[PDB]
Enzyme design. Structure first.
Site, mmCIF file in Angstrom:
data_model
loop_
_atom_site.group_PDB
_atom_site.id
_atom_site.type_symbol
_atom_site.label_atom_id
_atom_site.label_comp_id
_atom_site.label_asym_id
_atom_site.label_seq_id
_atom_site.Cartn_x
_atom_site.Cartn_y
_atom_site.Cartn_z
ATOM 1 N N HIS A 130 -22.891 14.856 35.633
ATOM 2 C CA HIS A 130 -22.687 16.266 35.974
ATOM 3 C C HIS A 130 -23.942 17.034 36.402
ATOM 4 C CE1 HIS A 130 -18.478 16.133 35.053
ATOM 5 N NE2 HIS A 130 -18.683 15.797 33.793
ATOM 6 N N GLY A 138 -22.485 19.650 31.774
ATOM 7 C CA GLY A 138 -21.540 18.718 31.186
ATOM 8 C C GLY A 138 -22.121 17.808 30.125
ATOM 9 N N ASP A 165 -14.483 7.962 34.733
ATOM 10 C CA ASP A 165 -14.496 8.922 33.630
ATOM 11 C C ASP A 165 -13.270 9.818 33.741
ATOM 12 O OD1 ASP A 165 -15.420 11.539 32.135
ATOM 13 O OD2 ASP A 165 -16.955 10.043 31.650
ATOM 14 N N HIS A 167 -13.410 12.915 33.599
ATOM 15 C CA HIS A 167 -13.871 14.063 34.372
ATOM 16 C C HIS A 167 -14.370 13.683 35.763
ATOM 17 C CE1 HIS A 167 -14.138 15.230 30.097
ATOM 18 N NE2 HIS A 167 -13.778 16.426 30.524
ATOM 19 N N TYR A 293 -15.217 10.550 23.174
ATOM 20 C CA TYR A 293 -15.441 11.414 22.022
ATOM 21 C C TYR A 293 -14.634 11.006 20.794
ATOM 22 C CZ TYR A 293 -17.593 13.650 25.919
ATOM 23 O OH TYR A 293 -18.366 13.893 27.022
HETATM 24 O O1 LIG Z 1 -17.529 13.404 29.397
HETATM 25 C C1 LIG Z 1 -17.579 14.464 30.003
HETATM 26 C C2 LIG Z 1 -17.374 15.775 29.281
HETATM 27 C C3 LIG Z 1 -18.520 16.729 29.558
HETATM 28 C C4 LIG Z 1 -17.967 18.077 29.999
HETATM 29 C C5 LIG Z 1 -17.363 18.877 28.851
HETATM 30 C C6 LIG Z 1 -16.471 19.981 29.405
HETATM 31 C C7 LIG Z 1 -16.501 21.263 28.583
HETATM 32 C C8 LIG Z 1 -15.688 21.093 27.320
HETATM 33 O O2 LIG Z 1 -14.790 20.268 27.297
HETATM 34 N N1 LIG Z 1 -16.039 21.905 26.319
HETATM 35 C C9 LIG Z 1 -15.477 21.978 25.032
HETATM 36 C C10 LIG Z 1 -14.420 21.171 24.615
HETATM 37 C C11 LIG Z 1 -13.912 21.291 23.328
HETATM 38 C C12 LIG Z 1 -14.460 22.214 22.445
HETATM 39 C C13 LIG Z 1 -15.518 23.018 22.855
HETATM 40 C C14 LIG Z 1 -16.025 22.897 24.143
HETATM 41 N N2 LIG Z 1 -17.791 14.528 31.313
HETATM 42 O O3 LIG Z 1 -17.966 13.347 32.026
HETATM 43 O O1 LIG Z 2 -9.947 25.453 16.700
HETATM 44 C C1 LIG Z 2 -9.778 24.662 15.789
HETATM 45 C C2 LIG Z 2 -10.733 23.513 15.574
HETATM 46 C C3 LIG Z 2 -10.146 22.289 16.256
HETATM 47 C C4 LIG Z 2 -11.016 21.063 16.032
HETATM 48 C C5 LIG Z 2 -10.599 19.965 16.998
HETATM 49 C C6 LIG Z 2 -11.276 18.647 16.650
HETATM 50 C C7 LIG Z 2 -10.936 17.572 17.674
HETATM 51 C C8 LIG Z 2 -11.658 17.838 18.978
HETATM 52 O O2 LIG Z 2 -11.211 18.652 19.772
HETATM 53 N N1 LIG Z 2 -12.776 17.129 19.139
HETATM 54 C C9 LIG Z 2 -13.645 17.142 20.246
HETATM 55 C C10 LIG Z 2 -13.301 17.715 21.469
HETATM 56 C C11 LIG Z 2 -14.189 17.686 22.537
HETATM 57 C C12 LIG Z 2 -15.425 17.068 22.393
HETATM 58 C C13 LIG Z 2 -15.770 16.482 21.182
HETATM 59 C C14 LIG Z 2 -14.881 16.515 20.114
HETATM 60 N N2 LIG Z 2 -8.754 24.744 14.947
HETATM 61 O O3 LIG Z 2 -7.831 25.773 15.083
HETATM 62 K K LIG Z 3 -14.050 10.189 37.138
HETATM 63 ZN ZN LIG Z 4 -15.837 12.813 30.786
#
Ligand SMILES: O=C(CCCCCCC(=O)Nc1ccccc1)NO
Ligand SMILES: O=C(CCCCCCC(=O)Nc1ccccc1)NO
Ligand SMILES: [K+]
Ligand SMILES: [Zn+2]
Ligand SMILES: [K+]
Ligand SMILES: [K+]
Ligand SMILES: [K+]
Ligand SMILES: [Zn+2]
Lengths: 371, 364
Positions: A130, A138, A165, A167, A293
């Site tokens: 990214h 990202g 990926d 994304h 993740y």
């Molecule tokens: O693997 C990835 C993911 C990187 C981009 C992440 C996007 C933003 C995002 O998902 N933010 C987020 C998600 C859950 C909770 C809080 C923030 N890209 O290749």
């Molecule tokens: O808002 C909340 C907290 C939710 C917590 C979700 C945990 C799973 C998750 O979304 N994990 C994750 C997502 C993006 C990147 C890394 C971890 N509850 O209401």
């Molecule tokens: K991709």
């Molecule tokens: Zn991704």
């Protein structure tokens, strides 16, 4: 030949400190080691990227800022937001080292391909696609995929970047949007609101790079069979039209069932068939990781994919190792698809494929200096 | 008569340090301040929860483990993984202080409702509904929602917990799954693989608490009108059967269009419509935040909701303030739904409503 495996205990420890994926590097390596797969690979210590090497893509001003933040930690430096630091890309201590290590690791792998040491080189901690020339994006600060491609460009005239990926690999596509030396292909979730929001089938690159960018917009819930049909179909057309001399393949595991992002519904077997198809081209292939993740599942996936690269079949039982307790409750390597619908209309998928086939008709195969 | 607003500069500053939502507390508060909404509210400084107050739900062993990590760090403590610390809930310095601050703020808000000080008390930095009695979960280490309900039980015979977060409020529901004096209603995304994976329509609580737990499994792409149709339909029957004396409302903004989780497709207007319906009851209401990962949109949402609580109409234009540059490219309060399909077929939705209506015939 024997595939190259980029690894050192210091490198893994460095990568373990990434704020968004803590300890994922050790989980991936330790599972690969527990299956004894490293024994069948040529372990190569990664070199740290020099300033000049990183500067092949990133601007000096941005790199110097990363360097500054890397020492002073998470103060609220007035320029951090401008350089993409913040929520997605935390400005903490040592981020410049993390950048330099991952970037250099991908460059080292690329150099191994150039020097004919191997036909396949692996850097599971790489694949961060990214980041822009002057901006973190990202979850990471440096675009090691671009740096790897730029290194390969020293020898290879036609390079194919395949991004599997979840994304869209916007950073890599944008970096080569205007050129025809590098063809980017991205299969990804495309849905208004979903990061990064780009990469529709109509996005085909610009100027002299027009039609040398391929995007395959996919909806939630896709599974192994249908994904592979799309991937092989597109890759067969791309290979025929572009005739790449080297491949960079990003294999982010956030498509795998169980991932908290809960979008695609893939298993590593499905990704594996995509990998198999690319491998049988028998070209210089640079393997990269990326998103993922569900940490245990990401290790599951890349361990399996490593086994596919080696042409080995792995036992279902997860062997005892450092992170054995994280593989409950079934403690097996296979991953079971979630019970949710595939939102992909077959006729929309087909329409997409038709657009792509038409775009690739415009693609020529010219030598350096043509006409 | 005037809504209580839980706030202090020190409280907001501490909440800003939450790993999963950096700066979000200041963004929410500064936008509320920018609309001068705090002047029409009674600003109550939050008190820090003591070990005794947190012990009303959380075990002493877990609470003492948090304090040890909070005074040190992650020295690869073998018991941390068992106490829920790790990926979702990072083991760093200050986590005990964070927990105590947010828990104490929800308790302070609940205490205000008790003292006849107001009929609405707000704690936007609260609403963390996942944590178990002996285990951190879902981006936080303490269940402040449960601690708030327990405080209200020192006064009110029946507590209704409405959870409009994107995620199932499993921590709250499980804590009161056996009792009939607290009823939990949760609207949430329910799809195999989506956190926390619980809260099906068939899940109705246990023992004496059977049918005193309501779950509304919703799919992706739901927008304002359909959502309110479901929420009103459910809350109409719930209010009529349960007859609550106090309401705890969790308004996690991860349902709002633009959230990176990209599941529901709501705007703060749809949520506000659900909020007005609840406020209509004129019962003592404890307002809580929760999820929300588009930080500017979360400030947009909770600022709007604060305006709904005050019965005020805010200007469409985001006023200049500390985080003004984060509100581009349009710089307006209103949020536009994403052009995504609604995956909720009306037959399944209506079937869910019938199933819920059926369960609600046993509550008396
Ligand atoms: O693997 C990835 C993911 C990187 C981009 C992440 C996007 C933003 C995002 O998902 N933010 C987020 C998600 C859950 C909770 C809080 C923030 N890209 O290749
Ligand atoms: O808002 C909340 C907290 C939710 C917590 C979700 C945990 C799973 C998750 O979304 N994990 C994750 C997502 C993006 C990147 C890394 C971890 N509850 O209401
Ligand atoms: K991709
Ligand atoms: Zn991704
Ligand atoms: K290109
Ligand atoms: K909910
Ligand atoms: K109950
Ligand atoms: Zn949530």
């Amino acid at each position: 030949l024997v595939p190259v495996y980029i690894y050192s205990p210091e490198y893994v420890s460095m990568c373990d400190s990434l704020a968004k994926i803590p300890k994922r590097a050790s989980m991936v390596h330790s599972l690969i080691e527990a299956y004894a797969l490293h024994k069948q690979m040529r372990i190569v210590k990664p070199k740290v990227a020099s300033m000049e090497e990183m500067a092949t893509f990133h601007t000096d001003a941005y790199l110097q800022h990363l360097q500054k933040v890397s020492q002073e930690g998470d103060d609220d430096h007035p320029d951090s937001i401008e350089y993409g630091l913040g929520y997605d890309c935390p400005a903490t201590e040592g981020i410049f080292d993390y950048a330099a290590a991952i970037g250099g690791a991908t460059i080292t792998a690329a150099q191994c391909l150039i020097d004919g040491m191997c036909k396949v080189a692996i850097n599971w901690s790489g694949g961060w696609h990214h980041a822009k020339k002057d901006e973190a994006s990202g979850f990471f600060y440096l675009n090691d995929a671009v740096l790897g491609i730029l290194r390969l460009r020293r020898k290879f005239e036609r390079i194919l970047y395949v991004d599997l990926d979840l994304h869209h690999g916007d950073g890599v596509e944008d970096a080569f949007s205007f050129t025809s030396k590098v063809m980017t292909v991205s299969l990804h979730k495309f849905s208004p609101g979903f990061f990064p929001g780009t990469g529709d089938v109509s996005d085909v690159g610009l100027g002299k790079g027009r039609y040398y960018s391929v995007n395959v917009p996919i909806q939630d819930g896709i599974q192994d069979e249908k994904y592979y049909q799309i991937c092989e179909s597109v890759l067969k057309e791309v290979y025929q039209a572009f005739n790449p001399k080297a491949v960079v393949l990003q294999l982010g595991a956030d498509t795998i069932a169980g991932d908290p992002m809960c979008s695609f519904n893939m298993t590593p077997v499905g990704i594996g068939k995509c990998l198999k198809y690319i491998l049988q081209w028998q070209l210089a292939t640079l393997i990269l990781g990326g998103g993922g993740y569900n940490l245990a599942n990401t290790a599951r996936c890349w361990t399996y994919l490593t086994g596919v690269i080696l042409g080995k079949t792995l036992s279902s039982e997860i062997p005892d190792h450092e992170f054995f307790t994280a593989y409950g409750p079934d403690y097996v390597l296979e991953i079971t698809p979630s019970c949710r619908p595939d939102r992909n209309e077959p006729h929309r998928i087909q329409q997409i494929l038709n657009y792509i086939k038409g775009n690739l008709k415009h693609v020529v195969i010219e030598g350096r200096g043509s006409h």
